[PDB]
């Protein structure tokens, strides 16, 4: 609340924790409706709130990087300090809102800025005794969680320019080919209907068609998408209607008065393995690698005489593999520059060396990324059309091949199951208590993120430490860090300095950290984001 005679004037001393309402909004579009900052029992209030952060000498307290978003709209030069949603979430990564770490350790997430910021002074103390007998999440938020904070802050609030001519253009190609898929299944009808309406889909699905099947449960389209050439025209319907709506259409109107650049939202907490996650626009749902996808990217651009560099490690994730399971074999395929995917069809078909592969170099890709979560054999048989035998065959030819990863599953498995939490390279934990559960398919699950999270887990911690390294030095040479999405950075320096600057950043992103495998980043330099591909 806080207590007693607790009430103070404006400002607080230093080291305080602040406390910050909005306008019921994301931060750089809202207004500061209130603010204040509990020191040692006391609570200050501000008097009018925007004068007020100047006095701050820094935001420590819960949400400390949406205020430095807010204050770096305002010219003001408010670095992020410490946060107890940063402590919480190491403590355990579904520890991911504000309310929810308050009712979990103790505590109201209230309304009213000088109880939040009480709160954040508790539960920073509450939490920084749970986690300083912690030497390796002590290391992760001192080296990569503080830091971080305030290199997402710059991230969010220097935004990506759009281009509004070429997305509303778009709009109009992608609203074309809506109304030839509509043509196209109005004559695989007869009649014209209305292809939204529940009523009628089923009508025409069930009743002037007879379908199988034949609702009941919702959406069964899918799988039905047989003889007839219309049920997958419905879908491709479906998805350019979800996509236009969702990542063409609303584009233009979330650019910023004040910026004329889009300013994305970036999350720290909001994942179970630890990845970084984006808000409004969602870019990890923008359909990487199908045409709409890569024209949807050209719409991101440069400022007027500047470049973007696209960054991308190249197979983090069975880089990571190869070096937590310490399978020779795996390590080697990359230590020597070979093609993982031939390699494999190499070890796996027992090819008379690399002799002629292409179907067998199909087969590998298939097996190689459809491991680490856990395609199992069925549908390894669907995208590999092939029985239920040749296909448990290719899964232990993998492992006859590369057994050290089977050894690493298994090793996983079983000290997840008795600590009862897997961890990272760097010592970043989820706990898997269902890994254990007599219901098969929760504990199938458990199983699952058990081994996820320590490669998809790594490879998120070597971006962010990556990230975090390159932020000074970015600043030396005057170039911004606009976007992380998947395994990828967007940076944004000045036309005469972006190859030094796609230099130094392959450069520290390739050595962050010492591995048995090379990293590997693809670097672009391109006008727009489609062409710094690369
Ligand atoms: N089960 C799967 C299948 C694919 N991917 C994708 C998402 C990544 O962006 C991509 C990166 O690797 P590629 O599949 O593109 O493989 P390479 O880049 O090695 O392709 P190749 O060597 O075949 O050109 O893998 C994934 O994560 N999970």
């Given at each position: 609340?806080?207590?007693?005679?607790?009430?103070?004037?404006?400002?607080?001393?230093?080291?305080?924790?602040?406390?910050?309402?909005?306008?019921?909004?994301?931060?750089?579009?809202?207004?500061?409706?209130?603010?204040?900052?509990?020191?040692?029992?006391?609570?200050?209030?501000?008097?009018?709130?925007?004068?007020?952060?100047?006095?701050?000498?820094?935001?420590?307290?819960?949400?400390?990087?949406?205020?430095?978003?807010?204050?770096?709209?305002?010219?003001?030069?408010?670095?992020?300090?410490?946060?107890?949603?940063?402590?919480?979430?190491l403590?355990?990564?579904?520890?991911?809102?504000?309310?929810?770490?308050?009712?979990?350790?103790?505590?109201?997430?209230?309304?009213?800025?000088?109880?939040?910021?009480?709160?954040?002074?508790?539960?920073?103390?509450?939490?920084?005794?749970?986690?300083?007998?912690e030497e390796r999440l002590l290391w992760l938020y001192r080296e990569v969680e503080?830091?971080?904070?305030?290199?997402?802050?710059?991230?969010?609030?220097?935004?990506?320019?759009?281009?509004?001519?070429?997305?509303?253009?778009?709009?109009?190609?992608?609203?074309?080919?809506?109304?030839?898929?509509?043509?196209?299944?109005?004559?695989?009808?007869?009649?014209?209907?209305?292809?939204?309406?529940?009523?009628?889909?089923?009508?025409?699905?069930?009743?002037?068609?007879?379908?199988?099947?034949?609702?009941?449960?919702?959406?069964?389209?899918?799988?039905?998408?047989?003889?007839?050439?219309?049920?997958?025209?419905?879908?491709?319907?479906?998805?350019?209607?979800?996509?236009?709506?969702?990542?063409?259409?609303?584009?233009?109107?979330?650019?910023?008065?004040?910026?004329?650049?889009?300013?994305?939202?970036?999350?720290?907490?909001?994942?179970?393995?630890?990845?970084?996650?984006?808000?409004?626009?969602?870019?990890?749902?923008?359909?990487?690698?199908?045409?709409?996808?890569?024209?949807?990217?050209?719409?991101?651009?440069?400022?007027?005489?500047?470049?973007?560099?696209?960054?991308?490690?190249?197979?983090?994730?069975?880089?990571?593999?190869?070096?937590?399971?310490?399978?020779?074999?795996?390590?080697?395929?990359?230590?020597?520059?070979?093609?993982?995917?031939?390699?494999?069809?190499?070890?796996?078909?027992?090819?008379?060396?690399?002799?002629?592969?292409?179907?067998?170099?199909?087969?590998?890709?298939?097996?190689?990324?459809?491991?680490?979560?856990?395609?199992?054999?069925?549908?390894?048989?669907?995208?590999?059309?092939?029985?239920?035998?040749?296909?448990?065959?290719?899964?232990?030819?993998?492992?006859?091949?590369?057994?050290?990863?089977?050894?690493?599953?298994?090793?996983?498995?079983?000290?997840?199951?008795?600590?009862?939490?897997?961890?990272?390279?760097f010592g970043r934990?989820?706990?898997?208590?269902?890994?254990?559960?007599?219901?098969?398919?929760?504990?199938?699950?458990?199983?699952?993120?058990?081994?996820?999270?320590?490669?998809?887990?790594?490879?998120?911690?070597?971006?962010?430490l990556?990230?975090?390294?390159?932020?000074?030095?970015?600043?030396?040479?005057?170039?911004?860090?606009?976007?992380?999405?998947?395994?990828?950075?967007?940076?944004?320096?000045?036309?005469?300095?972006?190859?030094?600057?796609?230099?130094?950043?392959?450069?520290?992103?390739?050595?962050?950290?010492?591995?048995?495998?090379?990293?590997?980043?693809?670097?672009?330099?391109?006008?727009?984001?489609?062409?710094?591909?690369?």
């Amino acid at each position: 609340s806080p207590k007693a005679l607790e009430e103070a004037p404006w400002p607080p001393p230093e080291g305080a924790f602040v406390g910050f309402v909005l306008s019921r909004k994301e931060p750089m579009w809202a207004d500061l409706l209130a603010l204040a900052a509990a020191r040692g029992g006391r609570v200050h209030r501000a008097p009018e709130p925007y004068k007020a952060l100047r006095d701050l000498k820094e935001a420590r307290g819960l949400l400390a990087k949406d205020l430095s978003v807010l204050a770096l709209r305002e010219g003001l030069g408010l670095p992020p300090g410490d946060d107890p949603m940063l402590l919480a979430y190491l403590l355990d990564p579904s520890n991911t809102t504000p309310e929810g770490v308050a009712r979990r350790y103790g505590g109201e997430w209230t309304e009213e800025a000088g109880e939040r910021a009480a709160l954040s002074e508790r539960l920073f103390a509450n939490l920084w005794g749970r986690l300083e007998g912690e030497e390796r999440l002590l290391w992760l938020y001192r080296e990569v969680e503080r830091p971080l904070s305030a290199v997402l802050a710059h991230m969010e609030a220097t935004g990506v320019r759009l281009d509004v001519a070429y997305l509303r253009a778009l709009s109009l190609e992608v609203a074309e080919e809506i109304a030839r898929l509509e043509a196209e299944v109005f004559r695989l009808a007869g009649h014209p209907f209305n292809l939204n309406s529940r009523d009628q889909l089923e009508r025409v699905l069930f009743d002037e068609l007879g379908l199988p099947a034949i609702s009941t449960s919702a959406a069964v389209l899918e799988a039905l998408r047989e003889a007839h050439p219309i049920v997958e025209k419905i879908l491709q319907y479906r998805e350019l209607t979800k996509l236009k709506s969702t990542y063409i259409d609303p584009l233009p109107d979330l650019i910023h008065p004040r910026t004329g650049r889009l300013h994305t939202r970036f999350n720290q907490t909001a994942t179970a393995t630890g990845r970084l996650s984006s808000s409004d626009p969602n870019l990890q749902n923008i359909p990487v690698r199908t045409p709409l996808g890569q024209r949807i990217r050209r719409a991101f651009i440069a400022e007027e005489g500047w470049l973007l560099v696209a960054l991308d490690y190249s197979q983090i994730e069975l880089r990571v593999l190869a070096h937590l399971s310490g399978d020779e074999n795996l390590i080697r395929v990359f230590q020597e520059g070979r093609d993982i995917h031939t390699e494999t069809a190499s070890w796996m078909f027992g090819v008379p060396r690399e002799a002629v592969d292409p179907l067998m170099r199909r087969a590998a890709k298939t097996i190689n990324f459809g491991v680490l979560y856990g395609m199992s054999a069925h549908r390894l048989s669907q995208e590999l059309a092939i029985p239920y035998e040749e296909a448990q065959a290719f899964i232990e030819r993998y492992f006859q091949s590369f057994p050290k990863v089977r050894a690493w599953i298994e090793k996983t498995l079983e000290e997840g199951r008795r600590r009862g939490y897997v961890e990272t390279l760097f010592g970043r934990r989820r706990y898997v208590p269902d890994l254990e559960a007599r219901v098969k398919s929760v504990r199938e699950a458990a199983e699952r993120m058990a081994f996820n999270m320590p490669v998809q887990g790594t490879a998120a911690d070597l971006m962010k430490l990556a990230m975090v390294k390159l932020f000074p030095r970015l600043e030396e040479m005057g170039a911004r860090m606009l976007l992380q999405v998947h395994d990828e950075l967007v940076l944004e320096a000045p036309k005469e300095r972006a190859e030094a600057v796609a230099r130094l950043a392959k450069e520290v992103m390739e050595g962050v950290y010492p591995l048995a495998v090379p990293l590997e980043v693809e670097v672009g330099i391109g006008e727009d984001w489609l062409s710094a591909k690369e």
